[PDB]
Design an enzyme around this catalytic site. Structure first.
Site, PDB file in Angstrom:
ATOM      1  N   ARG A 177      10.219   4.858   3.687  1.00 56.20           N
ATOM      2  CA  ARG A 177      10.737   6.010   2.962  1.00 56.20           C
ATOM      3  C   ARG A 177      11.808   6.847   3.677  1.00 56.20           C
ATOM      4  O   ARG A 177      12.335   7.784   3.077  1.00 56.20           O
ATOM      5  CB  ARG A 177       9.607   6.906   2.471  1.00 56.20           C
ATOM      6  CG  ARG A 177       8.772   6.290   1.361  1.00 56.20           C
ATOM      7  CD  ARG A 177       7.663   7.289   1.033  1.00 56.20           C
ATOM      8  NE  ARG A 177       6.462   7.125   1.866  1.00 56.20           N
ATOM      9  CZ  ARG A 177       5.470   8.016   1.914  1.00 56.20           C
ATOM     10  NH1 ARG A 177       5.557   9.138   1.199  1.00 56.20           N
ATOM     11  NH2 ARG A 177       4.378   7.798   2.639  1.00 56.20           N
TER      12      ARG A 177
ATOM     13  N   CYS B  50       4.283   3.392   1.248  1.00 58.03           N
ATOM     14  CA  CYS B  50       5.548   2.847   1.707  1.00 58.03           C
ATOM     15  C   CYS B  50       6.003   3.370   3.079  1.00 58.03           C
ATOM     16  O   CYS B  50       6.317   4.550   3.253  1.00 58.03           O
ATOM     17  CB  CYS B  50       6.672   3.099   0.691  1.00 58.03           C
ATOM     18  SG  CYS B  50       8.254   2.390   1.227  1.00 58.03           S
TER      19      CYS B  50
ATOM     20  N   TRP C 230      14.051  -4.103   1.613  1.00 61.75           N
ATOM     21  CA  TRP C 230      14.098  -5.255   2.509  1.00 61.75           C
ATOM     22  C   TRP C 230      12.749  -5.272   3.231  1.00 61.75           C
ATOM     23  O   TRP C 230      11.995  -4.276   3.186  1.00 61.75           O
ATOM     24  CB  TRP C 230      15.272  -5.199   3.486  1.00 61.75           C
ATOM     25  CG  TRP C 230      15.355  -3.974   4.306  1.00 61.75           C
ATOM     26  CD1 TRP C 230      14.610  -3.670   5.449  1.00 61.75           C
ATOM     27  CD2 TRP C 230      16.255  -2.861   4.096  1.00 61.75           C
ATOM     28  NE1 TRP C 230      14.984  -2.414   5.920  1.00 61.75           N
ATOM     29  CE2 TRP C 230      15.995  -1.907   5.129  1.00 61.75           C
ATOM     30  CE3 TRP C 230      17.213  -2.550   3.099  1.00 61.75           C
ATOM     31  CZ2 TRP C 230      16.675  -0.670   5.211  1.00 61.75           C
ATOM     32  CZ3 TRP C 230      17.918  -1.314   3.191  1.00 61.75           C
ATOM     33  CH2 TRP C 230      17.641  -0.392   4.250  1.00 61.75           C
TER      34      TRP C 230
ATOM     35  N   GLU D 175       5.086  -8.169   7.034  1.00 56.26           N
ATOM     36  CA  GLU D 175       4.630  -8.526   5.671  1.00 56.26           C
ATOM     37  C   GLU D 175       4.660 -10.038   5.515  1.00 56.26           C
ATOM     38  O   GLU D 175       3.797 -10.633   4.837  1.00 56.26           O
ATOM     39  CB  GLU D 175       5.532  -7.915   4.587  1.00 56.26           C
ATOM     40  CG  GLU D 175       5.603  -6.411   4.640  1.00 56.26           C
ATOM     41  CD  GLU D 175       6.567  -5.868   3.604  1.00 56.26           C
ATOM     42  OE1 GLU D 175       6.202  -5.842   2.389  1.00 56.26           O
ATOM     43  OE2 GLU D 175       7.684  -5.482   4.016  1.00 56.26           O
TER      44      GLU D 175
HETATM   45  C1  HEM Z   1      14.114  -0.075   2.336  1.00 56.29           C
HETATM   46  C2  HEM Z   1      13.244  -1.021   2.732  1.00 56.29           C
HETATM   47  C3  HEM Z   1      11.779  -0.887   2.514  1.00 56.29           C
HETATM   48  C4  HEM Z   1      10.777  -1.211   3.390  1.00 56.29           C
HETATM   49  C5  HEM Z   1      10.896  -1.776   4.779  1.00 56.29           C
HETATM   50  C6  HEM Z   1       9.538  -0.956   2.729  1.00 56.29           C
HETATM   51  C7  HEM Z   1       8.313  -1.177   3.363  1.00 56.29           C
HETATM   52  C8  HEM Z   1       7.149  -1.211   2.631  1.00 56.29           C
HETATM   53  C9  HEM Z   1       5.959  -1.834   3.059  1.00 56.29           C
HETATM   54  C10 HEM Z   1       5.759  -2.585   4.358  1.00 56.29           C
HETATM   55  C11 HEM Z   1       5.035  -1.623   2.081  1.00 56.29           C
HETATM   56  C12 HEM Z   1       3.610  -2.130   2.065  1.00 56.29           C
HETATM   57  C13 HEM Z   1       3.738  -3.576   1.593  1.00 56.29           C
HETATM   58  C14 HEM Z   1       2.442  -4.320   1.412  1.00 56.29           C
HETATM   59  O1  HEM Z   1       1.564  -4.270   2.299  1.00 56.29           O
HETATM   60  O2  HEM Z   1       2.256  -4.997   0.373  1.00 56.29           O
HETATM   61  C15 HEM Z   1       5.654  -0.881   1.039  1.00 56.29           C
HETATM   62  C16 HEM Z   1       4.965  -0.468  -0.095  1.00 56.29           C
HETATM   63  C17 HEM Z   1       5.669   0.167  -1.105  1.00 56.29           C
HETATM   64  N1  HEM Z   1       6.978   0.564  -1.097  1.00 56.29           N
HETATM   65 FE1  HEM Z   1       8.322   0.141   0.189  1.00 56.29          FE
HETATM   66  N2  HEM Z   1       9.762  -0.398   1.554  1.00 56.29           N
HETATM   67  C18 HEM Z   1      11.078  -0.392   1.286  1.00 56.29           C
HETATM   68  C19 HEM Z   1      11.746   0.028   0.119  1.00 56.29           C
HETATM   69  C20 HEM Z   1      11.108   0.476  -1.033  1.00 56.29           C
HETATM   70  C21 HEM Z   1      11.763   0.832  -2.220  1.00 56.29           C
HETATM   71  C22 HEM Z   1      13.257   0.676  -2.455  1.00 56.29           C
HETATM   72  C23 HEM Z   1      10.769   1.303  -3.097  1.00 56.29           C
HETATM   73  C24 HEM Z   1      10.880   1.784  -4.495  1.00 56.29           C
HETATM   74  C25 HEM Z   1      11.970   2.410  -4.994  1.00 56.29           C
HETATM   75  C26 HEM Z   1       9.530   1.219  -2.389  1.00 56.29           C
HETATM   76  C27 HEM Z   1       8.326   1.608  -2.890  1.00 56.29           C
HETATM   77  C28 HEM Z   1       7.171   1.068  -2.338  1.00 56.29           C
HETATM   78  C29 HEM Z   1       5.905   1.164  -3.096  1.00 56.29           C
HETATM   79  C30 HEM Z   1       5.759   1.781  -4.474  1.00 56.29           C
HETATM   80  C31 HEM Z   1       4.958   0.582  -2.343  1.00 56.29           C
HETATM   81  C32 HEM Z   1       3.476   0.406  -2.677  1.00 56.29           C
HETATM   82  C33 HEM Z   1       3.174  -0.976  -3.322  1.00 56.29           C
HETATM   83  C34 HEM Z   1       1.699  -1.183  -3.683  1.00 56.29           C
HETATM   84  O3  HEM Z   1       0.884  -0.239  -3.764  1.00 56.29           O
HETATM   85  O4  HEM Z   1       1.237  -2.331  -3.902  1.00 56.29           O
HETATM   86  N3  HEM Z   1       9.771   0.794  -1.120  1.00 56.29           N
HETATM   87  N4  HEM Z   1       6.947  -0.554   1.425  1.00 56.29           N
HETATM   88  C1  LIG Z   2      10.047  -2.650  -2.400  1.00 59.29           C
HETATM   89  C2  LIG Z   2       9.210  -3.305  -1.300  1.00 59.29           C
HETATM   90  C3  LIG Z   2       9.737  -3.519  -0.005  1.00 59.29           C
HETATM   91  C4  LIG Z   2       8.930  -4.150   0.966  1.00 59.29           C
HETATM   92  N1  LIG Z   2       9.355  -4.364   2.215  1.00 59.29           N
HETATM   93  N2  LIG Z   2       7.676  -4.539   0.713  1.00 59.29           N
HETATM   94  C5  LIG Z   2       7.151  -4.376  -0.528  1.00 59.29           C
HETATM   95  C6  LIG Z   2       5.732  -4.887  -0.721  1.00 59.29           C
HETATM   96  O1  LIG Z   2       5.163  -4.582  -1.994  1.00 59.29           O
HETATM   97  C7  LIG Z   2       4.422  -5.681  -2.460  1.00 59.29           C
HETATM   98  C8  LIG Z   2       3.401  -5.103  -3.418  1.00 59.29           C
HETATM   99  C9  LIG Z   2       2.736  -6.270  -4.117  1.00 59.29           C
HETATM  100  C10 LIG Z   2       1.275  -6.218  -3.703  1.00 59.29           C
HETATM  101  O2  LIG Z   2       0.549  -5.495  -4.703  1.00 59.29           O
HETATM  102  C11 LIG Z   2      -0.683  -4.963  -4.189  1.00 59.29           C
HETATM  103  C12 LIG Z   2      -1.745  -5.024  -5.257  1.00 59.29           C
HETATM  104  C13 LIG Z   2      -2.199  -6.269  -5.714  1.00 59.29           C
HETATM  105  C14 LIG Z   2      -3.181  -6.334  -6.709  1.00 59.29           C
HETATM  106  C15 LIG Z   2      -3.697  -7.662  -7.226  1.00 59.29           C
HETATM  107  C16 LIG Z   2      -3.683  -5.131  -7.215  1.00 59.29           C
HETATM  108  C17 LIG Z   2      -3.203  -3.911  -6.730  1.00 59.29           C
HETATM  109  N3  LIG Z   2      -3.712  -2.762  -7.232  1.00 59.29           N
HETATM  110  N4  LIG Z   2      -2.246  -3.871  -5.762  1.00 59.29           N
HETATM  111  C18 LIG Z   2       1.269  -5.432  -2.402  1.00 59.29           C
HETATM  112  N5  LIG Z   2       2.354  -4.511  -2.635  1.00 59.29           N
HETATM  113  C19 LIG Z   2       7.891  -3.736  -1.553  1.00 59.29           C
END
Ligand code: HEM
Ligand SMILES: Cc1cc(N)nc(COC[C@H]2C[C@H](OCc3cc(C)cc(N)n3)CN2)c1
Ligand code: HEM
Ligand SMILES: Cc1cc(N)nc(COC[C@H]2C[C@H](OCc3cc(C)cc(N)n3)CN2)c1
Ligand SMILES: C[C@H](O)[C@H](O)[C@H]1CNc2nc(N)[nH]c(=O)c2N1
Ligand SMILES: C[C@H](O)[C@H](O)[C@H]1CNc2nc(N)[nH]c(=O)c2N1
Ligand SMILES: [Zn+2]
Lengths: 403, 405
Positions: free
Chosen positions: B112, B109, B281, B286
């Site tokens: 953070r 993320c 947000w 993305e």
């Molecule tokens: C405040 C605004 C936030 C922004 C701009 C943001 C930004 C991002 C981005 C760009 C990613 C990668 C997304 C992707 O490529 O799919 C991400 C992943 C993640 N963020 Fe955030 N984030 C935010 C808030 C949060 C919040 C509120 C949480 C949880 C309480 C969170 C937890 C995560 C987690 C767990 C991932 C990993 C998802 C995965 O492995 O598929 N984030 N964040």
């Molecule tokens: C909370 C939040 C804020 C923000 N700006 N962006 C996000 C993006 O999280 C989206 C989550 C959904 C996809 O999941 C990834 C994924 C997909 C699959 C099929 C398997 C895997 N292990 N991981 C990429 N991250 C989450």
């Protein structure tokens, strides 16, 4: 367990079994991944590496287990037992150098690995000789703009003495002059090598693109200075296909990317001076060398010329300027008929390489952070490809600076 | 020097040592022989108690009562509860700390810097699928806040011995349908083909647009999931237009405002919250780079390039890079005009650098997954590209969990 390697664009899965052949450890452990780090965090040992590499060689000529093979292993064994070291046959060195390139995890251009001109310079005995060999390498590799990959291999490290070394990190490097006020004129990556040159008696220039002399060092001697003959150093002035003011920026870059400070390890032998060259991928010049904040850092200059809104990041001025700069590099190299590959074609060819290697070897070591280009990452197919990183030998390695 | 990973920034020349990684209990996928850092997903009794004890120790430190009588009494209470029931339960304030810490711990993320500002809705009283729906709608209303977005998580009852899980089947609260066509191609979002077909199998009447909002498939313990349609006015979307390319509006592209991940498991002190959707947000890449331009997503790059009159016949025109840039600008411009919170990849990564420095001082490191933190366009133009990162798993954690079907 062997790694499951998935391509997320196509849904396809391979298994890397080549990694089981890795004998040297990387930086990672189960507690923490150190993959994004740039730098690394007796006789039987040499003999095992020697035998292993000799096995690699005869296997590659399909003469595995032959008289030729066994007599060669005896030669190697007899030589180490008596002298603590051994020597490679030219054809083994040729095989080794190609294999080191093949095994280089950070190289996106490995589709080319079998096409490598190898100059044996192991009969070199003085800085003066090294220089003649380097000039010939440059002349051959440059080839009037039709670039050809090459390596020149100088004498191996020996227990009793200092190494042969090229002090410069590349054969072509632009000077960086540190100002009274800490700022830099020229290439800030080359401040320290520039200062070393002056100290060893070079008369400096004062431009942004002064080509440095070489500091060449024969064992246990002070390095010596050698100016490259200007006609040997092909350069490309940069213009843009549509923006006329771009030429006015006075930008240029050299044609030949030739790395001169890495160590080549073959069969446990070490080659501390073994400069190698291919041709550039456009993003190395357009994105990293010209746009890095700690390099020429021209993004703001270009943005203002393009009349962009610099006052806010969300106008994406940086992204827009970077793109035009990369396009200029591509346009200018094409106009000058000097070999260059854009990042889209390069990563497409690397994908094809991953597939050849899968069939040929059951895997390919690759460092994702280095393979993915520094602009437009996910626009290239390598972004979406999982990659396993590990060290095979023969290998190119980092080694300490000789000062 | 120090016996901890040395971490280097190549732009600034500065060095740190990560000492926090020492606190990692859970192993990742790497070994000395090979690095698996680029893989997206490489595959209790006393076990619970030690995770519990560790978490309770984390809690008491965060309120500076470590070693106190209130600390030792909470430990004893957790032991006694696990002793007699096989499980235990979190105080409200423990849940709030643990949810923030899970976000703070998430290596992938980039957002953070915001970790301390998270609204935690406690939904541990929920007992039906209808009620999950109400809680979810409440979350969406609160988080969306007419465009002025607010980070939030809603936590449903934990996994419990024997009994079935609370699960939200959909990967996000908002998802566009993906309809597999006769010719083998997909209308809508190809990422959502499977969840789309599951929604239909469970009685949803499918639309046929490129941007049909999916219903939610919600599963209460030991029950078949139930289907709930989001009231359209709860789902804020932004139509996409470009600041100077007038035809771009004609493309009819849009995206939703609220990124809300609904299929991850929140783990705190060994307790497992299998339904715990969280939202923030968007960072503009993305939407504009991944969702719109991935070849396996909407894949609009070529259409935009053709509209821009670029030479799509040759890689070296950089038509891809030009189109992508304009698509990103459209996303940014359109969210700004609509007053819906969005952050560009430059502002986001700069803020993540600041987060790294805060965490260096606060905990002596920050787990970070470089491949995920560096944006998908303009990588080396952002300061995170030049920053080495150490990736490791700390808990509380958000984790992937297998699909419920
Ligand atoms: C405040 C605004 C936030 C922004 C701009 C943001 C930004 C991002 C981005 C760009 C990613 C990668 C997304 C992707 O490529 O799919 C991400 C992943 C993640 N963020 Fe955030 N984030 C935010 C808030 C949060 C919040 C509120 C949480 C949880 C309480 C969170 C937890 C995560 C987690 C767990 C991932 C990993 C998802 C995965 O492995 O598929 N984030 N964040
Ligand atoms: C909370 C939040 C804020 C923000 N700006 N962006 C996000 C993006 O999280 C989206 C989550 C959904 C996809 O999941 C990834 C994924 C997909 C699959 C099929 C398997 C895997 N292990 N991981 C990429 N991250 C989450
Ligand atoms: C033929 C054209 C070639 C292309 C287009 C190419 C491309 C590249 C690129 C883009 C990098 C990353 C460089 C950086 O970011 O600084 C790289 C790294 C490297 N390539 Fe190549 N390559 C070529 C030929 C060669 C040859 C001939 C060798 C050796 C024989 C080689 C060995 C390497 C090595 C060892 C690295 C890693 C350097 C480091 O760790 O700093 N490549 N290659
Ligand atoms: C053969 C070749 C072809 C091509 N297209 N490009 C190249 C560029 O390789 C340049 C090499 C030299 C720098 O060395 C990085 C570096 C810097 C420092 C200070 C230490 C270190 N260990 N490594 C980065 N990559 C080489
Ligand atoms: C810290 C980080 O790994 C570093 O900036 C790397 C990232 N990827 C790279 N990739 C290439 N090709 N060349 C580089 O110098 C770098 N630098
Ligand atoms: C193979 C590779 O790990 C994969 O394509 C990753 C790369 N980096 C990413 N980074 C983010 N933020 N999101 C992603 O989905 C991915 N995908
Ligand atoms: Zn690793």
């Amino acid at each position: 367990k062997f790694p499951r390697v998935k391509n997320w664009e196509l849904g396809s899965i391979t298994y890397d079994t080549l990694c089981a052949q890795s004998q040297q450890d990387g930086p990672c452990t189960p507690r923490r991944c150190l993959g994004s780090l740039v730098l690394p965090r007796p006789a039987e040992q040499l003999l095992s590496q020697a035998r292993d590499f000799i096995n690699q060689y005869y296997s590659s000529i399909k003469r595995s287990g032959s008289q030729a093979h066994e007599e060669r292993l005896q030669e190697v064994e007899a030589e180490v037992a008596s002298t603590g070291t051994y020597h490679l046959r030219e054809s083994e060195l040729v095989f080794g150098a190609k294999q080191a390139w093949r095994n280089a995890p950070r190289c996106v251009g490995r589709i080319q690995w079998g096409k490598l001109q190898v100059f044996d310079a192991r009969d070199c005995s003085s800085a003066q000789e090294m220089f003649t060999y380097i000039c010939n390498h440059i002349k051959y590799a440059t080839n009037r703009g039709n670039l050809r990959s090459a390596i020149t291999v100088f004498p191996q490290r020996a227990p009793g003495r200092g190494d042969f070394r090229i002090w410069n990190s590349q054969l072509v490097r632009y000077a960086g002059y540190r100002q009274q006020d800490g700022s830099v004129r020229g290439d800030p990556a080359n401040v320290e090598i520039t200062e070393l040159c002056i100290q060893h008696g070079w008369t400096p220039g004062n431009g942004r693109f002064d080509v440095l002399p070489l500091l060449l060092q024969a064992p246990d001697e002070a390095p010596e200075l050698f100016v490259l003959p200007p006609e040997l150093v092909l350069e490309v002035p940069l213009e843009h296909p549509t923006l006329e003011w771009f030429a006015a920026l006075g930008l240029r870059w050299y044609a030949l990317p030739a790395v001169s400070n890495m160590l080549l390890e073959i069969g446990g032998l070490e080659f501390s001076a073994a400069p190698f060259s291919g041709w550039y991928m456009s993003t190395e010049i357009g994105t990293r060398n010209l746009c890095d904040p700690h390099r020429y850092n021209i993004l703001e200059d270009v943005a203002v010329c393009m009349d962009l809104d610099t006052r806010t990041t969300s106008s994406l001025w940086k992204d827009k300027a970077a793109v035009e700069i990369n396009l200029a590099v591509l346009h200018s190299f094409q106009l000058a008929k000097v070999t260059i590959v854009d990042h889209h074609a390069a990563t497409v060819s690397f994908m094809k390489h991953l597939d050849n290697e899968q069939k040929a070897r059951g895997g390919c070591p690759a460092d994702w952070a280095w393979i993915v280009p520094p602009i437009s990452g996910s626009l290239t197919p390598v972004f979406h490809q999982e990659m396993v990183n590990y060290i095979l030998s023969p290998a190119f390695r980092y080694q300490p600076d000789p000062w």
